[PDB]
Amino acid sequence: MAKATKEVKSKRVEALRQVAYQRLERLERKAQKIGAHLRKPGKAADLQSLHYLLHKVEVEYHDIARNLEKDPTWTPKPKMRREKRAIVPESGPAAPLPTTAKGEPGRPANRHIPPPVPLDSARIPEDQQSMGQGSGGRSWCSAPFVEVKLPPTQWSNVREKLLKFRIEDDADIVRRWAEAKFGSIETARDGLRASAEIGTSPDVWRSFISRAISNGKKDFEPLLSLDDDELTADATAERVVRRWHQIDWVGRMLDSILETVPSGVSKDTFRSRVESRLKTFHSSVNSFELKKRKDGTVERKRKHTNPQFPYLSPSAVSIDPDVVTMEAVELLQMQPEERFAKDPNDANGRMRLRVLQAELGKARREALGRRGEKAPPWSGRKVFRGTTTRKREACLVWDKEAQADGLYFALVMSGGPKIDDKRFVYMDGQPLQSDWQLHNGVAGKAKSCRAMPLILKHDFLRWYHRHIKNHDVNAPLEKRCVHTTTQFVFVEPDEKKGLQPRLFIRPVFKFYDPVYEVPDSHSIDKKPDCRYLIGIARGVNYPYRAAVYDCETNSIIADKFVDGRKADWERIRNELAYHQRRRDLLRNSRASSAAIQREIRAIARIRKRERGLNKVETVESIARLVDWAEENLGKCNYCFVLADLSSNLNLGRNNRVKHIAAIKEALINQMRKRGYRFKKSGKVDGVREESAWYTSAVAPSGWWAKKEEVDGAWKADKTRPLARKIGSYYCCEEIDGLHLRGVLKGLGRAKRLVLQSDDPSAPTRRRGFGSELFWDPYCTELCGHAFPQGVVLDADFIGAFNIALRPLVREELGKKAKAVDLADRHQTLNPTVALRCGVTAYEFVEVGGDPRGGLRKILLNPAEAVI
DNA sequence: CGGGATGCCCAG
DNA sequence: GTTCACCAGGGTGTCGCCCTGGGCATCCCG
RNA sequence: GUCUGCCGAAGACGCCGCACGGAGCCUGGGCCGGAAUCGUAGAUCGAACGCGGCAUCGAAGCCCUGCAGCCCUUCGGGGCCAAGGCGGCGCAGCAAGCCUCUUUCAGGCGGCAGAGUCCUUUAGAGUGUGAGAGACACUCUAAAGGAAUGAAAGAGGGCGACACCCUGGUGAAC
């Protein structure tokens, strides 16, 4: 019988491959029919729709051909050609929210109003005495716009003066220059990337160091006599040759562009903007990162993923259906085996079927282009932005006669009266005569400007009261400022609906930069010299958890945290998916269009509710945490230790509630605005990044809880899960004041808990905690409270505690360390550090003949128990 | 003569 | 019930740089 | 403008009043069907598979599309030509949008008479200044037309890049 099975198996594979060839030539016949049918003159239904059927049948051709050539024992019985391709969500499971006006926060009216400004004394440091270009400073912008009141009759002259500094419609000059100089845009991008790169040949290197020496620098005289392979591997010489190649190449291309500038464009601000963009480009193509291999050799890896020339992103071109029709039928004319070969004309060397699929996508993109958005405009109307990067350009003067709200945005033009030097004064408090930048008459300058009044509303008044304390001579130096530049935006007038032109300005205040610092904040082998350490645990559902730590008492002091909107994001995503499905299934189907419009409005409702989700609440709580830290802990006495998470870690469906790098960015900006020093590497003193491996999963009671022993104990005891697997077995909500345990559904991704749910098709509280809860069974007692089978704590609290206690271990061990040594040092040190704050925990309550049957949360406050 | 404009230069 | 490979439409987060001016030479026209 | 006296329903919410196409190329939409194929002899039993044929509801995308309607416009018209469906009966704070970017919360928005306040324009009149031009400064008085946001956070602009997620049109691996 066995020899019969072997010969019959060869018959099976040969017969099924014969079926594959018969179906293949069936596709080929169908493709010939439709390609000769698309040929039929005047056809515009075989266009697009059965052009899509053409790429479908050719994709099936390529897939059948590949599945037959790659696999010699091709025996297809997987039951997918008999599969109906069902969609498992229901047709109508609509579940909106019923919560409505159950309190509604108030708005305690406050009367913020900017008081007048005195002249600052000689407390200014020496490096920021002039406050010109690059002379210290912080240059912190202004997060709200403020509306200036344009004159009702002279606003056209103001618009004419502001049209010089207009930022948009400058890309078209750069694209026109690329078209006129290198023919095509892609050829321009490739040739300009080739010219911007620096060679590894030491001849041009030595030429650029010789140019550096002849320009007045005497530091690189032994660099000319250095060995060629040594100067190639020299990082300092690499930076020098990069800066001089930047100067030469940016100068050459800048001219090439300013020679091709049309008349009317102001060449000064265009020169500055284009020079900054080309400096950005030549830095980003030639910046190389020290990537080491296993043998210690440094690989010259570029930080930027794929830099291209500025103002040269690939814009979508509206291709026509006729040329993609001709290219498709011409691809069909050649032999079908080479129809899926690499295209010699493609830049990426794509497949011919792939480039025709992309061309068909463009051909149906031209009818569905810049439309269909969920209406997010800036004011709706036609605007043009810009910036005024000078004091001769524009500034904020203060009216000395007004005791409050006397800020005026003075902007210089040919028309208008002369500015008053005795009534108007700069916003720092210094007079108009100190700077001579817009004063008329004396010191050889003559300037006349109109000071249009400022409309101070809640946003700008709140920002000016929070960020600027310019009315106090002896103010902290991080609150005093000077104003040089303004990122205005001009909203153009409309005559169709009869509106009024409005100008919004965003000032950019160069704040004075004090020398505030905490020592050894970014020292690798040194703990920061401060009394307090704050450990931020950035998580997925809880955004951050803070556990501040004082080394004098060696205990946690506070446990501030927020809740996050993960489950709300899940609900919005599910309702958005259902409404998108019902809208899209009702669009390809026709004779129903009011249904399309009402589900467009339902999509807009869910878009507004998703627009409610943002990082604003997270950065608001970060600001509140930093303010609380500076109030209670005191200035220059803390350091926000953060876990060094991956910069581009990938999550699942919770991308809109990730906000992980936003916490680090917000903390860096918040500690920058407090006055703390900002190093050139992008680090601010008081925000220290330290890496956390599985050592951030060790217990405060002294348990490492390694993944190997946790996996072994969970395999031996499925009903008793350890580490963070305990939280996945319990319901998120509560029944009888407490959360029950449940049984997982055996499907991997459809994880539905069974909380003794004998009710048919009952989801109940199918959502669980997941990895959010850490249960330590070895901690049967904690903070004056007893637990029979251990205490369940938040995993983010454990991570925050480990992060806050980590730099002590880092200083005790040294620079060279592995995670095992940090783990055992944490295992020994953990028990010794105590808790003097209310630490959120859970209790194993007796449910159903078992103390592990339920979870109940209490405060567990040492301030009520220990002290 | 002089108010205002336009454009270039300041480079471990 | 999954996973991957394309093409549309929509939405997010995140990342490399640079910027966040004054002096001054010449034009320039009423 | 704004505030008060007085008047009302947009747009939503329940009810029904109605909708231009197949030659040719995809699919339901109904049938019928065995073979090339498979349940590890035969595989003719069953499973189906890509399909073949018949008739047909008729639609996906086009030829037919009128500018029914919206956008652009040099104002003549052109583009998509479908949409927006539209169009009544009862319900009249209860949508969207706006009052500033990124958000949250509270609040306001729609006809005609009355009242004050501010700004802008202007007038008479008056005061001093004014090598004196009845010019200027500016006051008094009067008239014309314009004038809802609080509260809590934010480093925001560019330029070029990535990497997720959702829904359709598909194909392949399980």
Automatic annotation (TrEMBL):
<protein>
    <submittedName>
        <fullName>Uncharacterized protein</fullName>
    </submittedName>
</protein>
